[PDB]
Amino acid sequence: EDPMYEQFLQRIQAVRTATVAKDISADILEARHDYFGRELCRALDIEYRNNVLLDEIILDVYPGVNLMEYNVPHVTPDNYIWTGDMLLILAYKVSVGHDSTEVTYKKYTTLILPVMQEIGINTEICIIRANPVTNQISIVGEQFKRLFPTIPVELNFARFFELRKMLLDKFA
Ligand SMILES: [Cl-]
Ligand SMILES: [Mn+2]
Structure with missing residues (x-):
C-alpha cells in the first residue's frame, strides 16, 4: 500500500x-528513475531536484549574467551541483546497459556546455547509473567521483520490477 504502487x-x-x-510502462520507468535520484541525493546530502531549466541553473549560479545576449537551449537536466568554482550537471539513470547513458551524455554535452563556455562557467557533464538488478553504481564525471568517492545508498527496485512484470504478463 505505497500510493505510487x-x-x-x-x-x-x-x-x-x-x-x-x-504509457504505464514509461511512467514506471520514470518513477524508477526518480526514486533512484531521490535516494541518491539523500545519501549524498545534495539537494534533490528533477528537471530544472538550464536558464534557471545559470541564474542560480550567476544571477548577474546578462542572460538576454545568450542563446540558452531550453533543456532540463536531472540536477546540478554548484561548488562555487565548477558546475556539475547531473543526470540519473537506472539501466543494465550503457546505451541510455551514452545517449544522454552526448545530448547534455551538445546542449549545455557551449552556452556555459560563452558565459564562462566551468561546467562538467556527470551521469550516475544504478543497475536495478545488482544495485551497482556506475559514475561518469571525474570531478563528481572526486567529490563523492563513497556513495552509501541502499536501493530496492523490486516494487518497480514487480509492476513491470505484471504488465509484461498481461500482454505476452
Ligand atoms: Cl532511467
Ligand atoms: Mn530526466
Missing part, C-alpha cells in the same frame, strides 16, 4: 490496450 497496480489492472499500456 497502488496507483500503478490500479492502472495495470484497468488497462486493456498494448497502446495505453505503453
